[PDB]
Design a protein around this nucleic acid. Structure first.
Ligand SMILES: Nc1ncnc2c1ncn2[C@@H]1O[C@H](COP(=O)(O)OP(=O)(O)O)[C@@H](O)[C@H]1O
Length: 641
RNA sequence: GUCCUGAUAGUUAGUAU
RNA sequence: UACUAACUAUCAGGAC
């Protein structure tokens, strides 16, 4: 059951938004989704009506795939309207005009990603004259060449009576580092782009009392890294000798070995960093994993790096002999096993999480890390430590979550996630049987997670938005926010925290009424260096400078050729300097042999290589359409056998 | 499970003016 | 302040 009775500030915000374009700024849990749903319900009298003579429909936009299901479910639950869902997996590329028209006629509210909406707009399937309300989710992304900004260019050229109402939702207006004197400039730029107003609640005290009364308490904890033990210094000396002999080999290096020797250099640096930050046991684990993963890579490699791997195995042997020698006397020595930072983290856990476990209360906690290897190793260590049936560690169950779709061009990284397993892990966390989670900045925003009693910043935030979001994650009663900082950087972090506090104070000051943008402010929209290509006038499909290379690559890919060869186009550059005293770049392009066009194509002289490439792609698109490889809708020809 | 193309954010070096 | 080259974290769209 939802809160049928709205709060007074919700009603005030709805009344304000019904009049003009507005952007709502509120903290998490205020209920911005409820406001959006209510606004959709209010204007429901313009939606019903056939689409073949001038009907209108309402659109919703999001950033990530999982949010589609959440928002569709919320809308379907709270109100009784037909709702559709569309993402990039159903192969919506191959649809024709008739299928799109049928879908538009059948539904009343649509929820799709931004890229799909842009693709629909560019190819002439909708003219933006049949939209009654358009909603931006996480509106603070509209900067530079983001799809949100490219959508507004079509809004720019419309008439006065065709303009649909625009609404946006956000939590932090700024999205990057900003000294306290640039906040007004950033806010004005954002307001100019979206052509709306930034407003907040006039009863923010009531909102804070009702919901934000669970505001977390900040605690700063310091640690010192110059407390290495005898094992640490012994291993450090071992790596020192190893890097000395490696430098000797680099002095005696030759061709086809400098790259290999640099690979050994980076491996040794990684090992040293892991040992310094985490401790000896993690170094042992990483060395063993590196051996087991390089076991498969032994084939078709030069003998010199086999010898290097042999000496690496020798250092493995000596270090494991030393580790066993101490283990014969350590008997699971906690202080020697881990670095000082891990000891401090363990102390914090005992101080707060175990103490809460002593009381009859539920436990939920998250740990934020920067890299991915660190998250994996921390989960391994915590599980291993809890497995020993310790008195204080028998109630801690740990799992980790890493970003999907984040496959690099290398570093398979020992069971990368890159799949739907995020859904399974999050379902585990919501259901129960998991109190502690390790996350590499992937659950920060736009995901439903349960209330957490404790949040730990194992690493420092990098800008205002990250700090605000991570602070807002914790919402349970008596929640605590903890930041761990080295000793020598305390003053620098204190200055940065003061800056963040000042920015937050200015943002709250913004609560007062603000002047609406003038028409010239909207006219301050920048223009691209070259105009688009409209073959059928202003109402037809277009090709833009920012949507040409991808289209060319798609057309090349759909060519009939061998499945083992992509046959992508190739590019070259030529540089020249003219009397403007700024170096000029001119690009060039060539097509694969399969396409009917075999001729070099040259773009305009452009200041940067990016723009030269874009110009060449645009000219190639022109030449392709003139020949007849693209249909009436500027799509690749869909001829099939 | 592979192989391409775009978008945003932090750091390092060289180079203007 | 603009350009060139490396490293780290996140997202979307089409091929086999
Ligand atoms: N009328 C209401 N007033 C306040 N809170 C409400 C109301 N109706 C529902 N809620 C609750 O507020 C929560 C808002 O969720 P969500 O949209 O994620 O927060 P936010 O809008 O801050 O992102 C919902 O989980 C819902 O249970």
């Amino acid at each position: 059951e939802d809160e049928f009775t709205p709060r007074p500030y919700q009603v005030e915000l709805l009344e304000r938004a019904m009049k003009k374009n507005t952007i709502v700024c509120l903290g998490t849990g205020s209920g911005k989704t409820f406001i959006a749903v209510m606004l959709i319900k209010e204007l429901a009298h313009e939606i019903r009506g056939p689409f073949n003579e001038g009907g209108k429909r309402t659109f919703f936009l999001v950033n990530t795939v999982p949010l589609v299901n959440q928002q569709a479910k919320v809308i379907r639950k709270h109100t009784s309207l037909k709702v559709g869902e569309y993402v990039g997996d159903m192969g919506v590329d191959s649809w024709n005009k008739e299928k799109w028209n049928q879908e538009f006629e059948k539904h009343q509210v649509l929820v799709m990603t931004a890229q799909i909406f842009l693709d629909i707009l560019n190819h002439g399937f909708i003219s933006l004259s049949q939209v009654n309300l358009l909603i931006f989710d996480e509106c603070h992304h509209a900067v530079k060449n983001h799809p949100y900004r490219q959508i507004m260019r079509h809004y720019k050229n419309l008439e006065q009576n065709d303009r649909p109402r625009i609404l946006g939702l956000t939590a932090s207006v700024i999205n990057s580092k900003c000294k306290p004197n640039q906040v007004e400039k950033k806010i004005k730029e954002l307001e100019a782009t979206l052509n709306s107003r930034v407003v907040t609640a006039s009863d923010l005290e009531e909102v804070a009392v009702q919901k934000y009364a669970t505001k977390p308490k900040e605690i700063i904890v310091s640690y010192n890294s110059d407390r290495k033990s005898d094992t640490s210094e012994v291993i450090e000396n071992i790596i020192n000798q190893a890097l000395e002999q490696l430098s000797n080999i680099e002095e005696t290096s030759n061709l086809n070995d400098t790259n290999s020797l640099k690979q050994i250099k980076k491996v040794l640096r990684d090992i040293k960093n892991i040992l310094d930050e985490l401790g000896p046991w993690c170094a042992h684990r990483v060395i063993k994993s590196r051996i087991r993963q390089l076991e498969k890579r032994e084939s078709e490699t030069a003998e010199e790096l086999r010898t290097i791997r042999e000496l690496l195995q020798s250092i493995f042997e000596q270090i494991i002999n030393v580790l066993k020698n101490l283990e014969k006397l350590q008997k699971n020595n906690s202080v020697e096993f881990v670095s000082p930072k891990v000891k401090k983290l363990l102390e914090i856990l005992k101080q707060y999480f175990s103490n809460n476990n002593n009381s009859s209360k539920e436990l939920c906690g998250i740990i934020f890390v920067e890299r991915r290897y660190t998250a994996y190793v921390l989960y391994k260590l915590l599980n291993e430590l809890s497995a020993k049936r310790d008195d204080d560690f028998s109630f801690i169950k740990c799992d980790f979550v890493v970003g999907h779709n984040s496959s690099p061009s290398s570093k398979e990284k020992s069971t990368e996630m890159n799949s739907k397993k995020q859904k399974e892990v999050l379902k585990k966390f919501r259901k129960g049987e998991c109190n502690l989670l390790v996350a590499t900045s992937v659950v920060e925003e736009g995901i439903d997670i349960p209330k957490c009693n404790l949040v730990v910043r194992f690493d420092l935030p990098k800008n205002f938005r990250s700090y605000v979001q991570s602070k807002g994650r914790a919402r349970a009663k008596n929640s605590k926010y903890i930041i761990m900082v080295e000793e020598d950087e305390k003053n620098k972090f204190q200055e940065d925290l003061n800056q963040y506090q000042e920015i937050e104070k200015i943002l709250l000051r913004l609560c007062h009424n603000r002047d609406a943008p003038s028409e010239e402010d909207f006219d301050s929209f920048e223009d691209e260096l070259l105009p688009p290509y409209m073959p059928y006038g202003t109402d037809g499909p277009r090709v833009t400078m920012s949507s040409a290379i991808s289209l060319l690559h798609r057309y090349c890919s759909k060519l009939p050729s061998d499945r083992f060869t992509t046959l992508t186009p190739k590019f070259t550059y030529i540089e020249q300097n003219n009397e403007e005293e700024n170096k000029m770049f001119r690009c060039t392009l060539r097509l694969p042999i399969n396409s009917p066009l075999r001729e070099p194509i040259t773009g305009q002289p452009m200041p940067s290589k990016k723009l030269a490439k874009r110009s060449a792609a645009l000219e190639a698109c022109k030449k392709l359409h003139e020949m007849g490889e693209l249909d009436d809708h500027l799509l690749p020809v869909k001829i099939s056998r």
